[PDB]
Design a protein around this ligand. Structure first.
Ligand SMILES: N[C@@H](Cc1c[nH]c2ccccc12)C(=O)O
Ligand SMILES: [Mg+2]
Ligand SMILES: [Mg+2]
Ligand SMILES: [Mg+2]
Ligand SMILES: [Mg+2]
Ligand SMILES: [Mg+2]
Ligand SMILES: [Mg+2]
Ligand SMILES: [Mg+2]
Ligand SMILES: [Mg+2]
Ligand SMILES: [Mg+2]
Ligand SMILES: [Mg+2]
Ligand SMILES: [Mg+2]
Ligand SMILES: [Mg+2]
Ligand SMILES: [Mg+2]
Ligand SMILES: [Mg+2]
Ligand SMILES: [Mg+2]
Ligand SMILES: [Mg+2]
Ligand SMILES: [Mg+2]
Ligand SMILES: [Mg+2]
Ligand SMILES: [Mg+2]
Ligand SMILES: [Mg+2]
Ligand SMILES: [Mg+2]
Ligand SMILES: [Mg+2]
Ligand SMILES: [Mg+2]
Ligand SMILES: [Mg+2]
Ligand SMILES: [Mg+2]
Ligand SMILES: [Mg+2]
Ligand SMILES: [Mg+2]
Ligand SMILES: [Mg+2]
Ligand SMILES: [Mg+2]
Ligand SMILES: [Mg+2]
Ligand SMILES: [Mg+2]
Ligand SMILES: [Mg+2]
Ligand SMILES: [Mg+2]
Ligand SMILES: [Mg+2]
Ligand SMILES: [Mg+2]
Ligand SMILES: [Mg+2]
Ligand SMILES: [Mg+2]
Ligand SMILES: [Mg+2]
Lengths: 117, 103, 150, 56, 16, 110, 48, 142
RNA sequence: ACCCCGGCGAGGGGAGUGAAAAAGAACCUGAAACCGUGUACGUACAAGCAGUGGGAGCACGCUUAGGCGUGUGACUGCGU
RNA sequence: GGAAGAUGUAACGGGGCUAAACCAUGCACCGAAGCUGCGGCAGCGACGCGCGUUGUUGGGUAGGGGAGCGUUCUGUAAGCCUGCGAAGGUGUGCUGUGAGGCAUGCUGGAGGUAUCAGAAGUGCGAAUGCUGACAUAAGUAACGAUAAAGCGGGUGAAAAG
């Protein structure tokens, strides 16, 4: 029996364009270019999940370095002192304390200095 | 007053009466959960930090929601090598109510 | 397809993709690639397999009580009203009748009902035996069905 | 010569941004007939500077 | 048909 | 109240009549009559006919007043195009799209 | 037991190969034929 | 919880002033780059300008070590063909030295609108007088 | 039908028929490319497969007055 | 030192460095999709009753094997949904590992179809693929002999013709 592909092809193309909504020009209008754009978007989403973890760790590390250098110690000596004082506290959380509650971060600084000493 | 603890492979900084995203815990949807490992408590110019855990510092929580997160689409694509791959994923979570931080 | 074997244009130079026939399946109004031919769709069934299938059908019919056996089954006049009233008295609606002797009276009576079918024992077949809900027997029909299934 | 790629609708709007018409700034009114006309042109009925320049 | 500078010989066969 | 006048299959090019429409969009009606009277385009003549059709249309069928009428929406859509053949050099032929357009004006008082 | 309750035996109804129907079916593009040569040509191959 | 980001309208930008008499050009430029980028503030974000405004005084009295006073050659190109131009360190200290400081700091800074904004925050003065006393700039010790 | 603009036009708007004229003869439905108008946001010191991760601001809906959702996307890491 | 190249420095990636270079020793730290932690899925094997315990595996082209989604038609079906609105078209929300599925707003005005089976003209982005429609260059080239026109009056809604 003969099958016509109109409904199914329409549904597939509409799905791909709806994923491709928001792109510039033919990447959101033309189906071929939109399909090439969506696949690259998925690849970028994968690779940028991994890079999101990397970049957020880097940002926290820079903030800890800045706060510790205001407090009078380098980042590396601060971490070495923290590990000698045997705390398993996250760099994300230390960055949060460094932004919001300065006094607790200072307290961690003299604890790190005491563990180094 | 706030406190940082560790659960689900993360560490979270919470306060009194707080709604908190943990991952799925093997517990009922309406029951109170006891957290014993607490990294640090800060209460406004008096702080108690553990090495690595605070002695006597514990957390009262209330599991209020179980759920599945937002769907993300994993796309793998080797170009000119005729390889295409699609998969979906939703991650489980618990919403909890941090109701007590007792040192 | 009605057409000609003339090449639509020369092989090289014109800048178009090459073609050799107006009837190519790529082309619009061209032929079908693997066009169907009139074929036979019947299948060979072994006699023992068919008989064993019939035995399984009648056995599960007896098991689930869709099989009703009467000693005699006939009508006096070819009246579909009389036939439908008799099956209403028996409380049966979608019925396969099989009879020992082909009675033209009840056959013409049952010709017009599309939920009631009538058959001879040599004419029974698996698709109707499964399709019709209540299937009824005459005793002579039971005897000849039993002997022909052996 | 000829294009290597199709230009865009954005490019088309870029090029056509300088192609729009400029209307007349303001008309002039006859001091006698009160009819609007071009500046330094006669009126449709045949007036200019409030004086009959042509017949009919 | 075909373009004259493709049917031609001096400029089509430029590198023989 | 909105009053609509359309000229369908207008024998002109959509781009040119859009140039004239963009000239006269948003202005008050009598002013738009002055621009359309003194703009030197066949497009201007066509859309002037359409605009006076709109004004008399509102005057007869709605009874709104000419002094407060305003052309609030003008837009041209492309109409169907008539296809022709233009014979060129060396046997080749080109296709001429004798483009039309649909001109629309919406006049209103408020 | 009706006409819509009769199922075949398990493994009696293996589905046939459909060559050249997308990436995911595993038989797309070349359709199990490789790259060029008489084996991949239409009607190709050698005699017995 | 989400990681904090500095808000570009709520970030506080202070005014620091630095005397450049006898300081090493490269190490001064690194320190100024850290301050302009905001790497010294605990509320650092890489995508928001969070640094400080810096005034540099006596840019003509920077010191370089070795033969750099005469051997360090600055090259640039005018865009026209054959238009390469050289200028050594001593002749641009003779001509206009705020460009020496600015070229150093612009080389240390990131590239793009944000790096251009941080360079805009940088102020360099050749003499020992600045017009920005109205901002109460406080002295920084390098 | 009739009325009105319009060249005693083309075309349109009213009226009326009709369940429907968003069935008016270019006539069932009416997709996409393509072309427009209106609104929200962004854009005139800014360099590249135009996305993706982060994210300011703006606008609109909000129903624990809490943040959420949608639209946009300054700036930024990676990205032929 | 020997040591010279052709668009532009241009033989640290740049800035710049007399260490921010090199050698020797040490303690730190950053650093990958590696490893660990937490959670989820699937395959394979052992251990007791399709289930549970445990270990391990899961980049992939050509290719081999396994399991599925969807479309048209036939039976189930003179059944079921449907003018209190079908197919189709356009949005939104939810759900699955995916092909997908379900609900509903608007348009639409008459068909559609569960389940389990059966047959294939069963899934398209590519073939300088075929056919139709619509863009691009672009309101650009050109308006087809350089024998040539100007004015007055008429018609008409409008006259260089
Ligand atoms: N060059 C000439 C002569 C020509 C006609 N057809 C050709 C084909 C090939 C080469 C030259 C020609 C022209 O174009 O009229
Ligand atoms: Mg059919
Ligand atoms: Mg669109
Ligand atoms: Mg990692
Ligand atoms: Mg045919
Ligand atoms: Mg036989
Ligand atoms: Mg000819
Ligand atoms: Mg393969
Ligand atoms: Mg081969
Ligand atoms: Mg080969
Ligand atoms: Mg090939
Ligand atoms: Mg062959
Ligand atoms: Mg020279
Ligand atoms: Mg960079
Ligand atoms: Mg008419
Ligand atoms: Mg229609
Ligand atoms: Mg109909
Ligand atoms: Mg449309
Ligand atoms: Mg600007
Ligand atoms: Mg500049
Ligand atoms: Mg550019
Ligand atoms: Mg890049
Ligand atoms: Mg040179
Ligand atoms: Mg380490
Ligand atoms: Mg791993
Ligand atoms: Mg694999
Ligand atoms: Mg059917
Ligand atoms: Mg159908
Ligand atoms: Mg096919
Ligand atoms: Mg196609
Ligand atoms: Mg392909
Ligand atoms: Mg064309
Ligand atoms: Mg012109
Ligand atoms: Mg051009
Ligand atoms: Mg030109
Ligand atoms: Mg010309
Ligand atoms: Mg001529
Ligand atoms: Mg004349
Ligand atoms: Mg003439």
């Amino acid at each position: 029996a003969r099958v016509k592909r109109g409904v199914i092809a329409r549904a597939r193309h509409k799905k791909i364009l709806k994923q491709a909504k928001g792109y510039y020009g033919a990447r959101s209008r033309v189906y071929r270019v939109a399909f090439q754009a969506v696949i690259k978007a998925g690849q970028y989403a994968y690779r940028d999940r991994r890079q999101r973890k990397r970049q957020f760790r880097q940002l926290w590390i820079a903030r800890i370095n800045a706060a510790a250098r205001q407090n009078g110690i380098s980042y590396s000596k601060f971490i070495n002192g923290l590990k000698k004082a045997s705390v398993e506290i996250d760099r994300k959380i230390l960055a949060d304390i460094a932004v919001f509650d300065k006094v607790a971060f200072t307290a961690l600084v003299e604890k790190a200095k005491a563990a180094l000493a | 007053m706030y406190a940082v603890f560790q659960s689900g492979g993360k560490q979270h900084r919470v306060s009194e009466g707080q709604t908190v995203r943990l991952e799925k815990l093997d517990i009922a949807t309406g029951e109170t959960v006891e957290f014993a490992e607490v990294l640090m408590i800060a209460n406004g110019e008096e702080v108690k930090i553990g090495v690595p855990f605070v002695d006597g510092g514990v957390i009262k929580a209330e599991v209020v929601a179980h759920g599945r997160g937002e769907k993300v689409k994993i796309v793998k694509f080797r170009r000119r090598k005729h390889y295409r791959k699609q998969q979906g994923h939703r991650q489980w979570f618990t919403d909890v109510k941090i109701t007590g931080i007792s040192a | 397809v009605t057409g000609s074997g003339k090449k639509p244009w020369r092989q090289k130079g014109t800048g178009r993709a090459r073609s050799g026939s107006i009837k190519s399946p790529i082309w619009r109004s061209g032929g079908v690639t693997f066009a169907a031919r009139p074929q036979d769709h019947s299948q060979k069934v072994n006699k023992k397999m068919y008989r064993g299938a019939l035995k399984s059908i009648l056995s599960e019919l007896v098991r689930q009580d869709r099989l009703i056996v009467v000693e005699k089954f006939s009508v006096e006049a070819p009246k579909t009203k009389l036939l439908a009233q008799k099956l209403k008295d028996m409380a049966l609606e979608d019925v396969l009748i099989i009879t020992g002797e082909l009675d033209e009276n009840l056959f013409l009576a049952a010709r017009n009902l599309h939920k009631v079918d009538v058959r001879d024992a040599t004419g029974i077949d698996p698709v109707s035996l499964i399709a019709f809900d209540k299937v009824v027997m005459t005793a002579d029909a039971v005897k000849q069905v039993e002997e022909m299934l052996a | 010569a000829v294009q290597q790629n199709k230009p865009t609708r954005s490019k088309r709007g870029m090029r056509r941004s300088h192609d729009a018409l400029t209307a007349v700034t303001s008309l002039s009114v006859d001091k006698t007939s009160g009819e609007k006309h071009l500046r330094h042109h006669i009126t449709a009925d045949g007036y200019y500077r409030g004086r009959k320049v042509i017949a009919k | 048909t075909s373009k004259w500078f493709n049917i031609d010989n001096k400029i089509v066969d430029h590198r023989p | 109240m909105e009053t609509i006048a359309k000229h369908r299959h207008a024998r002109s090019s959509a781009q040119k009549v859009r140039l004239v429409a963009d000239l006269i969009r948003g202005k008050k009606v009598s002013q738009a009559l002055d621009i359309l009277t003194y703009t030197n385009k066949k497009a201007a003549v066509l859309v002037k006919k359409v605009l006076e059709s709109a004004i008399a249309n509102a005057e007869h069928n709605d009874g709104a007043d000419i002094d407060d009428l305003k052309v609030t929406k003008i837009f041209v859509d492309e109409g169907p195009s008539m296809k022709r053949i233009m014979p060129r050099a060396k046997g080749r032929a080109d296709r001429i799209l004798k483009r039309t357009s649909h001109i629309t004006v919406v006049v209103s008082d408020r | 037991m009706r006409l819509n309750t009769l199922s075949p035996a398990e493994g009696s109804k293996k589905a046939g190969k459909r060559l050249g129907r997308g990436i995911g079916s595993g038989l797309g593009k070349t359709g199990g034929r490789g790259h060029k040569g008489q084996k991949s040509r239409s009607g190709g191959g050698v005699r017995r | 919880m989400k990681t904090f980001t500095a808000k570009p309208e709520t970030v506080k930008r202070d005014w620091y002033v630095v005397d450049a008499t006898g300081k090493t050009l490269g190490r001064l430029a690194t320190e100024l780059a850290r301050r302009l980028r905001g790497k010294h503030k605990a509320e650092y974000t890489p995508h928001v300008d969070t640094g400080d405004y810096i005034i540099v005084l006596n840019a003509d009295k920077v010191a370089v070590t070795g033969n750099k006073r005469t051997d360090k050659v600055y090259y640039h190109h005018t865009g026209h063909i054959g238009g390469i131009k050289q200028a050594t360190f001593e002749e641009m200290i003779a001509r206009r030295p705020e460009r020496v400081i600015e070229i150093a700091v612009k080389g240390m800074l990131p590239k793009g609108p944000l790096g251009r904004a941080m360079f805009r925050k940088l102020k360099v003065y050749a003499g020992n007088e600045h017009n920005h006393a109205a901002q109460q700039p406080q002295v920084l010790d390098i």
